[PDB]
Amino acid sequence: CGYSDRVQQITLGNSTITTQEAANAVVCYAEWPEYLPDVDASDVNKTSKPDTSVCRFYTLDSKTWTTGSKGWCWKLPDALKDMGVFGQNMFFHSLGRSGYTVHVQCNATKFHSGCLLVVVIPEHQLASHEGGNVSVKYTFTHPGERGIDLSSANEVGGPVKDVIYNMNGTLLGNLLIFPHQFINLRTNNTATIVIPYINSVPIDSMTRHNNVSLMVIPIAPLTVPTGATPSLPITVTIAPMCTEFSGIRSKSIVPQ
Amino acid sequence: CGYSDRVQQITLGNSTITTQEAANAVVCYAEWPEYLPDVDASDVNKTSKPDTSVCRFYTLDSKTWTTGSKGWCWKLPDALKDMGVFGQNMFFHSLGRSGYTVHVQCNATKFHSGCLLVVVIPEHQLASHEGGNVSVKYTFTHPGERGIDLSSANEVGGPVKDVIYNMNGTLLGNLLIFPHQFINLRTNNTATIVIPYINSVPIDSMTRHNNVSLMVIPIAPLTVPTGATPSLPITVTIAPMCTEFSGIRSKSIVPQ
Amino acid sequence: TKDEVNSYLIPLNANRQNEQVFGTNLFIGDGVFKTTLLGEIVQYYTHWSGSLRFSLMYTGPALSSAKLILAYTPPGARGPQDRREAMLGTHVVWDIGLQSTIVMTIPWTSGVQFRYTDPDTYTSAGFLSCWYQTSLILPPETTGQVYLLSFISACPDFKLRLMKDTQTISQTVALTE
Amino acid sequence: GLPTTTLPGSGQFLTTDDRQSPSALPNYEPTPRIHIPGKVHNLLEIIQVDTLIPMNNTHTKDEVNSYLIPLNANRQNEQVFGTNLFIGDGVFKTTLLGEIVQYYTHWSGSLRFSLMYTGPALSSAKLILAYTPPGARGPQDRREAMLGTHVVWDIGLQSTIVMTIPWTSGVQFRYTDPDTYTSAGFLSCWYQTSLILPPETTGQVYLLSFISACPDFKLRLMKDTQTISQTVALTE
Amino acid sequence: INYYKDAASTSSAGQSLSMDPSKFTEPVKDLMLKGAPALN
Amino acid sequence: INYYKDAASTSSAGQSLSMDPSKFTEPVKDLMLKGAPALN
Amino acid sequence: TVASISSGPKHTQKVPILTANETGATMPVLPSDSIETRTTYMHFNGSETDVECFLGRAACVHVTEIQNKDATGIDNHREAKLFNDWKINLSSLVQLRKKLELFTYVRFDSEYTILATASQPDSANYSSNLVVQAMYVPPGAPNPKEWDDYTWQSASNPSVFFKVGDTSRFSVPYVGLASAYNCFYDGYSHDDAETQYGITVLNHMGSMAFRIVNEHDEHKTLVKIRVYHRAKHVEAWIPRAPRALPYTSIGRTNYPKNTEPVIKKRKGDIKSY
Amino acid sequence: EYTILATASQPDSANYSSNLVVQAMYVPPGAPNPKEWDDYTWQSASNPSVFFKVGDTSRFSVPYVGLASAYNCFYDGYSHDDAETQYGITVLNHMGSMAFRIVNEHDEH
Amino acid sequence: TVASISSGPKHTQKVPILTANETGATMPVLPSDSIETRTTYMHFNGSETDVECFL
RNA sequence: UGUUUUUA
RNA sequence: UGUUUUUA
Structure with missing residues (x-):
């Protein structure tokens, strides 16, 4: 009896992800994503379960990890609003509910050094940099597949981007209480985090509210071998699962 | 229960081959070599089965794989005509029948890049470079342990040596229909191909006719690390098995 | 310019993000496939059905790393011009490691039960593309291009019918000995 | 009437097809059968019969001498005769085996070669009959010959040796017509010791050579012989 | 129904269903199983 | 009696009595019954 | 027979999509391994891809011009085309050759169809009712030397007589010496420096001689004979790389110098569609 | 079930009615369409072909060769989503092609 | 039907290779009498040498 | 049991 | 027993 736990395959719909250097997948709070049951349901409308047309891996535009990269943050389901049929359903329905399989990818040689913290934060309410009672504007909290680069400059009505304070006034070291995985280049090239639907309500508006936030944060900085390109690509691939939509309706218009 | 399929030992006679980076051995057409049975036999003479004195690994003089190497071809049993007792029996008998365990060896570092195609072609009838109805002369088709270097120049009465056309007017990419194995330096350092006896006749003349032809062809060119010798040795080791000889007789004289 | 061994070698380049590796239509009786065993046998027939098996084998250093995304684009849409477009179709994200080879099956995606082996618009099979998922990272002291080997084979659900003469061979004069 | 479709090759005369045909003599009674000795069912019966080889194939005209292989007294380590084993050619062409063999394209199986000594009873000789399988030349000396299939023949009360040429071939069938690939090899005879003649006897003694088929012999694909010819149709 | 003595006279055998x-x-x-590591 | 291997070689099927x-x-x-008001 | 099985999401340590082609094995990976599949059935037997169907239909193998004319004052009837001889080979017409050469060894019973068609290019009053004789001349048998030689008697040789315009059709069993014909022979007749490579009598099907048995008319009638061969009870071994370059000779793997590239160069880069 | 009837006529001076043999060759899409009357194509090593005398007839069955479960007598569609592509015309109904030659060499007439 | 029987070394007073052709008899001497033989089968009926086929 | 089929 | 076949 031999085989491996580092070699993994995830097939969702027509999409397949393979990894040969995987660290054991994280299932947030030991709870797999599931469809809403009738005993928790409030909305009487029969939910559209879109199956394999949306429950598939959407790869997000790659990020560049440099020696001076502070990190990146994505909001879900926001990040997938422009992704195929999922995005359309998201905008055509009043209510939406979805779990996610997040798959973060960062490959390097055995000469490379560095560690990413891949963490999923439910209700990642961002802090404004202006302090006081200043609000973070819709456009900045809903960036899409672009996400928020924490290495960037502040913007008027935008969030605070000091990765040390998790953009919320909590310390970085404590993010490990949230379902997380490291991409330690010596050990691992892929993180995977299966997220269930986490909310105080059984189903919610997908446009106005982001249930979870994916953060990829360099802890140990990238140290490339001598003469190497001082950069590594980080590719985020997200698949909705157990997705439910309710209250189909004219397409919602959002800011921008 | 743990162990490995990359670590292999083949013991034939007084010879033993070991490998620690083996790709699963190929048995041509899922058929192991066997002695000729009485129901297929034509020749009435009791066959000499020479056992372990010939059924042993003969290592062929090493080849040098450069960045500009096109490939190498050996003919069997021709290549082993000067090898110990097998060669003697080959020349002393009218009829011969033999299977082979081919073992091709090419070791490199984890920094090296390159891929060899090790392929066994039954009835590898070579094409003349002169075109028309020009014949390939005996001496060129029967080189011995030297084999044919495809990187070499053409010779009058010699074969065509464009590896792209498999020396026969077929394309290189299609050789994979023949029992083959790759030596991909990142994965593998040794190919092994067990060849049964393949012929339209139960036993045949070993001198005038070559049943199979071993080709080792660089597909992905050798890319050595910076500052390395731009060469790798390729060593071919062949063992006859289930060898039968019939019609012992004065030693045959061949050209050259 | 001429048929070369290099023609079988798909070049990979280090430190390329979100960039195309290769692209081809899936007329298996034409183009890159014409000369393959699959293509050659396919051209002896008029109709084909079933799934194709597409394999990539990495031949770079063992101490190199790469993630590629193999994408099949069903017909009706153009060949993908970027990765984000490609990944919307059938795709395999390929982590290059100890296992050198990926095997992406092109699933039989057709309305009509049989496609023409000869390039026909109505019975187009679609497009196949490969992209850098992350990048190719080479170890120190290694330079230049590494290569993929591409393989094509039929799945056991493959079908061929209506035999025909190939256009892969020709003659003007009957041969002599 | 039954609908039919005539295939191509309709109205063709094929010399090999065994079809029924209308009899031109209806209700005719053919003469009764009586017992005649020597009924032949198969050619493979009669081809098993020994016939003399004109091995001494060295004469200006066909002679009885052509059947006589000369032996010479007091010759050591010397050749008696030599021949290739194209049985549809050379010395074998005119034999019954050769004649029947030439009516066929392919042959397989073992040949039976016999030598009968006709010298004085008070003479003595040892001969070595050697069959050389194909791939090697015809043996130029005895030491070369004896490496192949051979019978050392002591000449005594039994006048005849019978050396079987064992079927030594890779391909299952050989061509009756001289072909290089399907060469059967060579047959030779040498003095093992010598011919010793008694006092008051001189000159040459002779061997008679016979060729016959072994029961494992095979012939197929009938053909016209080149052993007979004509320019004009014959008259009575 | 065969109209001839010879086996060569007969029609084609159709299909060998044995692949x-x-x-x-x-x-x-x-033995290499689909799913199992090809090499170990 | 069919003289060929192929189904295409056979004669026409005659009539489908199933109308x-x-x-x-x-x-x-x-369901609309003859005699009943078509609409009610 | 199931074509595609039903298969849902996979989260597994068995990665059917990952393998090592270095092994020389083609893993039977299915769509069910890469995607989510629905149940489908084959509705297909693969009858047309059987070698008996693939190799087992008629093909032109030889075409020959012979003339029925007065034989007076002609010294060679073979070369005046009063009769022509064909060394039987399936390697002369390339379309059939490529099919056979997908394999190394083939054992088949043959079925020949000979079609003779007449033409009177010069002034003729009528279309003569000529009868062609097709005579099978196996190796060793006397090859005809004259159009009405004693050879044509065919006392033991197989022979067919048929009218021009009409056709002949005869089966021939597998006549090979070996257990199978060699489409390829990496060897020689014997160990000789100048002997023929590839060419061997292992494939000597025999010969076919064609004459018009009719005496001459006043007008010359040219008869083009076309030999068609159909393989039956086909058995094939050792599949090969398909022929890519054109042929130059019968029984040789030879290809022309300066031959064109057969790999179909792209319009644009490796990225183009 | 096809029936091909070839009938000859010599409108100009002719001494006799030639005993011509027509070849009807089925050329499915992709197969090399004949370019010359005695081209290598007519060899029909894999192509179905019929030879019959002029004045006489040929008769052969052809199974349903359609890609779909049935032929379309009508097709309210296009080959692809293109502004200038052909409407109605589709290869769904490509039975194939038939090439006809007389295999006989020429006479004077 | 057996063509050749298996036969090993012979050290015997029965000399199948020695005869007298003076008798007018052709002794059915086999390869098994002169050499060491392996078992082979005929795979052959002799159909083509029958006089009905020959004549 | 984040289990895969088959049948009402 | 200087023994020859057949079967595991």
Whole structure:
């Protein structure tokens, strides 16, 4: 009896992800994503379960990890609003509910050094940099597949981007209480985090509210071998699962 | 229960081959070599089965794989005509029948890049470079342990040596229909191909006719690390098995 | 310019993000496939059905790393011009490691039960593309291009019918000995 | 009437097809059968019969001498005769085996070669009959010959040796017509010791050579012989 | 119904339903299962 | 008696005695009886 | 027979999509391994891809011009085309050759169809009712030397007589010396420096001689004979790389110098569609 | 079930009615369409072909060769989503092609 | 039907290779009498040498 | 049991 | 027993 736990395959719909250097997948709070049951349901409308047309891996535009990269943050389901049929359903329905399989990818040689913290934060309410009672504007909290680069400059009505304070006034070291995985280049090239639907309500508006936030944060900085390109690509691939939509309706218009 | 399929030992006679980076051995057409049975036999003479004195690994003089190497071809049993007792029996008998365990060896570092195609072609009838109805002369088709270097120049009465056309007017990419194995330096350092006896006749003349032809062809060119010798040795080791000889007789004289 | 061994070698380049590796239509009786065993046998027939098996084998250093995304684009849409477009179709994200080879099956995606082996618009099979998922990272002291080997084979659900003469061979004069 | 479709090759005369045909003599009674000795069912019966080889194939005209292989007294380590084993050619062409063999394209199986000594009873000789399988030349000396299939023949009360040429071939069938690939090899005879003649006897003694088929012999694909010819149709 | 003495006279045999692509596709000594690491 | 291997070689099938004009004449969801008010 | 099985999401340590082609094995990976599949059935037997169907239909193998004319004052009837001889080979017409050469060894019973068609290019009053004789001349048998030689008697040789315009059709069993014909022979007749490579009598099907048995008319009638061969009870071994370059000779793997590239160069880069 | 009837006529001076043999060759899409009357194509090593005398007839069955479960007598569609592509015309109904030659060499007439 | 029987070394007073052709008899001497033989089968009926086929 | 089929 | 077949 031999085989491996580092070699993994995830097939969702027509999409397949393979990894040969995987660290054991994280299932947030030991709870797999599931469809809403009738005993928790409030909305009487029969939910559209879109199956394999949306429950598939959407790869997000790659990020560049440099020696001076502070990190990146994505909001879900926001990040997938422009992704195929999922995005359309998201905008055509009043209510939406979805779990996610997040798959973060960062490959390097055995000469490379560095560690990413891949963490999923439910209700990642961002802090404004202006302090006081200043609000973070819709456009900045809903960036899409672009996400928020924490290495960037502040913007008027935008969030605070000091990765040390998790953009919320909590310390970085404590993010490990949230379902997380490291991409330690010596050990691992892929993180995977299966997220269930986490909310105080059984189903919610997908446009106005982001249930979870994916953060990829360099802890140990990238140290490339001598003469190497001082950069590594980080590719985020997200698949909705157990997705439910309710209250189909004219397409919602959002800011921008 | 743990162990490995990359670590292999083949013991034939007084010879033993070991490998620690083996790709699963190929048995041509899922058929192991066997002695000729009485129901297929034509020749009435009791066959000499020479056992372990010939059924042993003969290592062929090493080849040098450069960045500009096109490939190498050996003919069997021709290549082993000067090898110990097998060669003697080959020349002393009218009829011969033999299977082979081919073992091709090419070791490199984890920094090296390159891929060899090790392929066994039954009835590898070579094409003349002169075109028309020009014949390939005996001496060129029967080189011995030297084999044919495809990187070499053409010779009058010699074969065509464009590896792209498999020396026969077929394309290189299609050789994979023949029992083959790759030596991909990142994965593998040794190919092994067990060849049964393949012929339209139960036993045949070993001198005038070559049943199979071993080709080792660089597909992905050798890319050595910076500052390395731009060469790798390729060593071919062949063992006859289930060898039968019939019609012992004065030693045959061949050209050259 | 001429048929070369290099023609079988798909070049990979280090430190390329979100960039195309290769692209081809899936007329298996034409183009890159014409000369393959699959293509050659396919051209002896008029109709084909079933799934194709597409394999990539990495031949770079063992101490190199790469993630590629193999994408099949069903017909009706153009060949993908970027990765984000490609990944919307059938795709395999390929982590290059100890296992050198990926095997992406092109699933039989057709309305009509049989496609023409000869390039026909109505019975187009679609497009196949490969992209850098992350990048190719080479170890120190290694330079230049590494290569993929591409393989094509039929799945056991493959079908061929209506035999025909190939256009892969020709003659003007009957041969002599 | 039954609908039919005539295939191509309709109205063709094929010399090999065994079809029924209308009899031109209806209700005719053919003469009764009586017992005649020597009924032949198969050619493979009669081809098993020994016939003399004109091995001494060295004469200006066909002679009885052509059947006589000369032996010479007091010759050591010397050749008696030599021949290739194209049985549809050379010395074998005119034999019954050769004649029947030439009516066929392919042959397989073992040949039976016999030598009968006709010298004085008070003479003595040892001969070595050697069959050389194909791939090697015809043996130029005895030491070369004896490496192949051979019978050392002591000449005594039994006048005849019978050396079987064992079927030594890779391909299952050989061509009756001289072909290089399907060469059967060579047959030779040498003095093992010598011919010793008694006092008051001189000159040459002779061997008679016979060729016959072994029961494992095979012939197929009938053909016209080149052993007979004509320019004009014959008259009575 | 065959109208001739010879076997060569008969029509074609139709189809050999017995396929085994394994002899060409998997001519390996050790058994390789789909899903299992090809090498270990 | 068929003289060929192929199904295409056979003669025509004659007649499909199975008619059902209803699929063309009465392709209605609710059943309409002759004599009953067509609408009510 | 199931074509595609039903298969849902996979989260597994068994990665059917990952393998090592270095092994020389083609893993039977299915769509069910890469995607989510629905149940489908084959509705297909693969009858047309059987070698008996693939190799087992008629093909032109030889075409020959012979003339029925007065034989007076002609010294060679073979070369005046009063009769022509064909060394039987399936390697002269390339379309059939490529099919056979997908394999190394082939064992088949043959079925020949000979079609003779007449033409009177010069002034003729009528279309002569000529009868062609097709005579099978196996190796060793006397090859005809004259159009009405004693050879044509065919006392033991197989022979067919048929009218021009009409056709002949005869089966021939597998006549090979070996257990199968060699489409390829990496060897020689014997160990000789100048002997023929590839060419061997292992494939000597025999010969076919064609004459018009009719005496001459006043007008010359040219008869083009076309030999068609159909393989039956086909058995094939050792599949090969398909022929890519054109042929130059019968029984040789030779290809022309300066031959064109057969790999179909792209319009644009490796990225183009 | 096809029936091909070839009938000859010599409108100009002719001494006799030639005993011509027509070849009807089925050329499915992709197969090399004949370019010359005695081209290598007519060899029909894999192509179905019929030879019959002029004045006489040929008769052969052909199974349903359609890609779909049935032929379309009408097709309210296009080959692809293109502004200038052909409407109605589709290869769904490509039975194939038939090439006809007389295999006989020429006479004077 | 057996063509050749298996036969090993012979050290015997029965000399199948020695005869007298003076008798007018052709002794059915086999390869098994002169050499060491392996078992082979005929795979052959002799159909083509029958006089009905020959004549 | 984040289990895969088959049947009402 | 200087023994020859057949079967595991």
